PDB file of C-alpha atoms in Angstrom:
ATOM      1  CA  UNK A 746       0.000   0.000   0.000  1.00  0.00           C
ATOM      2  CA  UNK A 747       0.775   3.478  -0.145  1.00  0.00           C
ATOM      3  CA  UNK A 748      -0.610   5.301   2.655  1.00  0.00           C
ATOM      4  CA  UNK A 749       1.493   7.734   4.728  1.00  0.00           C
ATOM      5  CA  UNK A 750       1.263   9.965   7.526  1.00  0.00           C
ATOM      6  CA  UNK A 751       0.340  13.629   7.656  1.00  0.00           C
ATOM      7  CA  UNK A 752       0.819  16.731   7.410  1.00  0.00           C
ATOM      8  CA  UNK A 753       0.167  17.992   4.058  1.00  0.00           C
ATOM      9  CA  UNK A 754       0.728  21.979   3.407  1.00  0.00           C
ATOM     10  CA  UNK A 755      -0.600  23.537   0.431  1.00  0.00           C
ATOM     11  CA  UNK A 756      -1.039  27.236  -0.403  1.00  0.00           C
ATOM     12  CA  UNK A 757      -4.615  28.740   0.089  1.00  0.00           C
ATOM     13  CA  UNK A 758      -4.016  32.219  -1.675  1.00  0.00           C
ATOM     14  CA  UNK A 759      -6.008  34.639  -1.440  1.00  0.00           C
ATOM     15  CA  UNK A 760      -9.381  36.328   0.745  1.00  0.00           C
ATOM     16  CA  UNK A 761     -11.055  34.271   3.311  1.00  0.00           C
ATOM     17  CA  UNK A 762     -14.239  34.884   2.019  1.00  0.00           C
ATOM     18  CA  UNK A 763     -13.830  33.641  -1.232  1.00  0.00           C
ATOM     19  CA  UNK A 764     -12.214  30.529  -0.714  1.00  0.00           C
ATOM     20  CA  UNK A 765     -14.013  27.531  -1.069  1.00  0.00           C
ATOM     21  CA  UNK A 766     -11.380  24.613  -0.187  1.00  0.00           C
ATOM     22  CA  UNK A 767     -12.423  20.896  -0.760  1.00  0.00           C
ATOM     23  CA  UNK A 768     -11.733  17.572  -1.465  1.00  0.00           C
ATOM     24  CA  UNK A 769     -13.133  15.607  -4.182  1.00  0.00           C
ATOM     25  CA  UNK A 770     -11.255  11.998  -5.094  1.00  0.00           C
ATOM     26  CA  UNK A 771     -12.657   9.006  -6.700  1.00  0.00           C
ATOM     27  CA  UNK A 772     -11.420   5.920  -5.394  1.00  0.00           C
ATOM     28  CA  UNK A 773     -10.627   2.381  -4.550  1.00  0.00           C
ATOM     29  CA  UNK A 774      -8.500   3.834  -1.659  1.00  0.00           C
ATOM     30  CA  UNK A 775      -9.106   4.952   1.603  1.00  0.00           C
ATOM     31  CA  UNK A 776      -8.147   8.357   3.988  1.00  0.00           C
ATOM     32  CA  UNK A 777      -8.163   9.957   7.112  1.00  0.00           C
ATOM     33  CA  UNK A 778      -8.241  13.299   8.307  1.00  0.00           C
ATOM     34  CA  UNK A 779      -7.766  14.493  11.381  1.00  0.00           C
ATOM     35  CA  UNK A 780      -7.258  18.193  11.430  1.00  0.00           C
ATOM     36  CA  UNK A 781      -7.283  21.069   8.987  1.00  0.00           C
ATOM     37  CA  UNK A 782      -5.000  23.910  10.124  1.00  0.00           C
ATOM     38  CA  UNK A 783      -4.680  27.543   8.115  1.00  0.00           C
ATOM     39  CA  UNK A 784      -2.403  30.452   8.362  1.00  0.00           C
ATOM     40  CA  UNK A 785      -2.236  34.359   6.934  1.00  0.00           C
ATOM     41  CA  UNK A 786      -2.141  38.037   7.382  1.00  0.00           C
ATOM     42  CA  UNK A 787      -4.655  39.558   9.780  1.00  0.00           C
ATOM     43  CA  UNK A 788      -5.358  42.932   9.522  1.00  0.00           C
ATOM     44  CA  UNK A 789      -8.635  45.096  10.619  1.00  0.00           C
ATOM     45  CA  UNK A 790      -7.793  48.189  10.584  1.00  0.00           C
ATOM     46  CA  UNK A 791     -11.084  49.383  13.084  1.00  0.00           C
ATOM     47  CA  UNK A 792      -9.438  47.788  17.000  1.00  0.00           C
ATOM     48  CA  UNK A 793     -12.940  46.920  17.836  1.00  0.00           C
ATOM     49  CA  UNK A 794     -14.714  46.370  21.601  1.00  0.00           C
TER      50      UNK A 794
ATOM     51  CA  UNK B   3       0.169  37.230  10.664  1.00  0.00           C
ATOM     52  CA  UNK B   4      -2.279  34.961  12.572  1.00  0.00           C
ATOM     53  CA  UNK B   5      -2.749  31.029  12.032  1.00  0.00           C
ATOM     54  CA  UNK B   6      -4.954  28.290  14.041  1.00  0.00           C
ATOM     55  CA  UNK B   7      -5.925  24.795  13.843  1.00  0.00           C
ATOM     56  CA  UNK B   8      -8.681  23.009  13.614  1.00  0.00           C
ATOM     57  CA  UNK B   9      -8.843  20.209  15.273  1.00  0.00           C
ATOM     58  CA  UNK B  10     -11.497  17.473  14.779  1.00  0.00           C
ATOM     59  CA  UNK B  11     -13.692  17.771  11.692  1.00  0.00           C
ATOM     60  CA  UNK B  12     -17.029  16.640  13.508  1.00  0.00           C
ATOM     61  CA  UNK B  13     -19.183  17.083  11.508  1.00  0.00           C
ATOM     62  CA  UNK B  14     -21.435  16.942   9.079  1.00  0.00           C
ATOM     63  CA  UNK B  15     -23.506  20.042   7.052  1.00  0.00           C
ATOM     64  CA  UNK B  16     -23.845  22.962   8.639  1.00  0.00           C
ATOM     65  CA  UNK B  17     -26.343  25.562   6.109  1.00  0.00           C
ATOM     66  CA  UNK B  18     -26.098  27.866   8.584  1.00  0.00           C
ATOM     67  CA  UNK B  19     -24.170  30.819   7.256  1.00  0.00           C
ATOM     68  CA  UNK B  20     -20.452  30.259   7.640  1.00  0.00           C
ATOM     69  CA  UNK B  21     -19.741  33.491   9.709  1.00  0.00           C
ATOM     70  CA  UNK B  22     -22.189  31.929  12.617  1.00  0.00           C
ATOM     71  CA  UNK B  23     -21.524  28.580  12.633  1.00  0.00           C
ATOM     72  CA  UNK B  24     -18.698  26.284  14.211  1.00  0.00           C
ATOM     73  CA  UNK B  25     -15.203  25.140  13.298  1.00  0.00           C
ATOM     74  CA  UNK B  26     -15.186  21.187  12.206  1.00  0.00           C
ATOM     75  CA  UNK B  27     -18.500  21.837  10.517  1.00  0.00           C
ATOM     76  CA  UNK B  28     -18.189  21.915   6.605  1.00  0.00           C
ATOM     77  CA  UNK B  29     -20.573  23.148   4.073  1.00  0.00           C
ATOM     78  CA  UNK B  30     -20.983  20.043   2.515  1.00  0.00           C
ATOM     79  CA  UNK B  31     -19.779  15.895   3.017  1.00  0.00           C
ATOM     80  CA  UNK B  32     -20.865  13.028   0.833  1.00  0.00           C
ATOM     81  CA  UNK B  33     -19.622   9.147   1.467  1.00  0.00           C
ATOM     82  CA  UNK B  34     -18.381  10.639   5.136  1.00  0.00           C
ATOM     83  CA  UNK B  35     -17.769   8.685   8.012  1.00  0.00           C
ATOM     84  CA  UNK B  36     -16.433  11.325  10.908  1.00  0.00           C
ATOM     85  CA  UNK B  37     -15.465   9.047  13.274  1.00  0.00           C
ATOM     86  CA  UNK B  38     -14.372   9.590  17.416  1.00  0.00           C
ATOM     87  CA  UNK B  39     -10.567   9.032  17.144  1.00  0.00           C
ATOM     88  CA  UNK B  40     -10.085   9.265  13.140  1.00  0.00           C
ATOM     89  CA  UNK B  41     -11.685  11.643  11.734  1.00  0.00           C
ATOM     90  CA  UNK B  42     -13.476  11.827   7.894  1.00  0.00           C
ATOM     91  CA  UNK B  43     -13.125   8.510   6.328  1.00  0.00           C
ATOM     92  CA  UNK B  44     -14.893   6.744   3.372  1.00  0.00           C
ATOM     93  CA  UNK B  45     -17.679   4.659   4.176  1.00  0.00           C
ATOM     94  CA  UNK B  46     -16.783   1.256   3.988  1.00  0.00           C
ATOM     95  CA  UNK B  47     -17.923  -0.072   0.414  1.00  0.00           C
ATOM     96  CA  UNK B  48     -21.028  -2.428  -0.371  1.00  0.00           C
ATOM     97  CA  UNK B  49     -20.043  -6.058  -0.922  1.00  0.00           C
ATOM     98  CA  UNK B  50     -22.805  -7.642  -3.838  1.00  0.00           C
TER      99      UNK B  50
ATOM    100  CA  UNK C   3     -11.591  54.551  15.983  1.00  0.00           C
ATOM    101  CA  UNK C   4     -14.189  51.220  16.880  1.00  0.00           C
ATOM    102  CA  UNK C   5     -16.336  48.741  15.357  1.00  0.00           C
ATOM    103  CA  UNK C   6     -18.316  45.870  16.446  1.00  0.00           C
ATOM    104  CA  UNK C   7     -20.437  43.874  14.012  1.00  0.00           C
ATOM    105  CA  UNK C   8     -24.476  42.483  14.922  1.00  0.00           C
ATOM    106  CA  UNK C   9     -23.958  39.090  14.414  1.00  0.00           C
ATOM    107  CA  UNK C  10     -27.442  37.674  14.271  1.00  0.00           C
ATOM    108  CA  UNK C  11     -30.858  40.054  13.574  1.00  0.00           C
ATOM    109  CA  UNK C  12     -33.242  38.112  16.154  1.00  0.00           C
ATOM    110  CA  UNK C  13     -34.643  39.252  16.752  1.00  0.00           C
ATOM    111  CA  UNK C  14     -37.946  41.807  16.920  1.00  0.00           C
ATOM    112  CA  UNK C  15     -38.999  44.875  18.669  1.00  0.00           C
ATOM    113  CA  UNK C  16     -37.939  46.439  21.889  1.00  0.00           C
ATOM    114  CA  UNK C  17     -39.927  48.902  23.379  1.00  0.00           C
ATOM    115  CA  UNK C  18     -37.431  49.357  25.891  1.00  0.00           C
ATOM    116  CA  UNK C  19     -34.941  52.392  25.841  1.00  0.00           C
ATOM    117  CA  UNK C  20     -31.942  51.708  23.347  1.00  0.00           C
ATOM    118  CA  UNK C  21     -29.075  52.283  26.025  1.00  0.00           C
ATOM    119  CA  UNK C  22     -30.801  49.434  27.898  1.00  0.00           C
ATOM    120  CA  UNK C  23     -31.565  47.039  25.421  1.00  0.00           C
ATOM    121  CA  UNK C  24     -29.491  44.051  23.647  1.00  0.00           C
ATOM    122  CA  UNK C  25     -28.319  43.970  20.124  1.00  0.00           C
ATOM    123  CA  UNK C  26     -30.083  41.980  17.722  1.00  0.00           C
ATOM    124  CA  UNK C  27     -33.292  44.214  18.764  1.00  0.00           C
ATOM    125  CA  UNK C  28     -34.465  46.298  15.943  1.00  0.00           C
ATOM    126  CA  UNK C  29     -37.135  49.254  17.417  1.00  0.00           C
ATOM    127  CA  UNK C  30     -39.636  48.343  15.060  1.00  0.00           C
ATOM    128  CA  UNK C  31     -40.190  45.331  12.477  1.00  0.00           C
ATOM    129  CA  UNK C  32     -43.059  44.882  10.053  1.00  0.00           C
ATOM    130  CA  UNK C  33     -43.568  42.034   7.689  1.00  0.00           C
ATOM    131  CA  UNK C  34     -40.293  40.076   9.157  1.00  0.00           C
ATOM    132  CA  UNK C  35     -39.261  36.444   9.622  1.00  0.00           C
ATOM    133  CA  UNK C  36     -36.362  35.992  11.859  1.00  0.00           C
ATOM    134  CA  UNK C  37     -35.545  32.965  11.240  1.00  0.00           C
ATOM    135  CA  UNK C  38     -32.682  30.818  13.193  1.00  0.00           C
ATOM    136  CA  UNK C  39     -29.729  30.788  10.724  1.00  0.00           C
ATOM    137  CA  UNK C  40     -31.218  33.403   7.841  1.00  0.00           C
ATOM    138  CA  UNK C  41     -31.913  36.297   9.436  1.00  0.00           C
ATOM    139  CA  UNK C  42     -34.792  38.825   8.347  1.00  0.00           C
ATOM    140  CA  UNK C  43     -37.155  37.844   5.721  1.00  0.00           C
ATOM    141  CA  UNK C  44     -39.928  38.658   4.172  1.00  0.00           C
ATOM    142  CA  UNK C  45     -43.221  36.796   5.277  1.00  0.00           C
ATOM    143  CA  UNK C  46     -43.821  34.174   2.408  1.00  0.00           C
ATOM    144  CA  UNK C  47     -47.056  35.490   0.687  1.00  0.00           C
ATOM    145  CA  UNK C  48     -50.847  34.921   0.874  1.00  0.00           C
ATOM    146  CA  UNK C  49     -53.216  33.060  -1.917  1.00  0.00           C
ATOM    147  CA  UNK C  50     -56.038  33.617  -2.975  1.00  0.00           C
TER     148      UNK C  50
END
């Protein structure tokens, strides 16, 4: 088999809001996943509360 | 330059709008199995 | 310079004085449906 072990990064570029990420396959194979992490600039500009 | 994790993805649908609703929820999930420990898998396959 | 966003719109009036009541709590609301994830909406129609 080929199966591995995570992680797996992979560039999300681009506005939050537009972003649609997700995972089609096919398959006679199996996976897992555990957890789904994301990073990227923060900025709002109005320091609410 | 902020990051986080999410850490389960249980589960499921979640049409509520996506500025309301949880982390692990996803807008959509067909052939799905979240499990406890493991989380999405394929639902095991029909035998004939 | 602040900012705070109204998450949800539900819901309805508040005859209460604003500086005492919550958000979500328009002062007055005619023809609405607040429902639980949309928000305001138009009442679905009559027939005839």
């Amino acid at each position: 088999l080929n199966l591995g072990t995570g992680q797996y990064r992979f560039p999300v570029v681009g506005n939050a809001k537009f972003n649609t990420v997700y995972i089609l396959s096919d398959e006679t194979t199996p996976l897992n996943i555990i957890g789904c992490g994301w990073e990227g600039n923060y900025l709002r500009r109005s320091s609410g509360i | 330059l902020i990051s986080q994790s999410i850490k389960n993805l249980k589960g499921g649908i979640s049409q509520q709008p996506d500025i309301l609703r949880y982390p692990d929820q996803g807008s959509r999930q067909v052939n799905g199995w979240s499990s406890e420990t493991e989380g999405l898998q394929k639902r095991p396959p029909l035998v004939f």
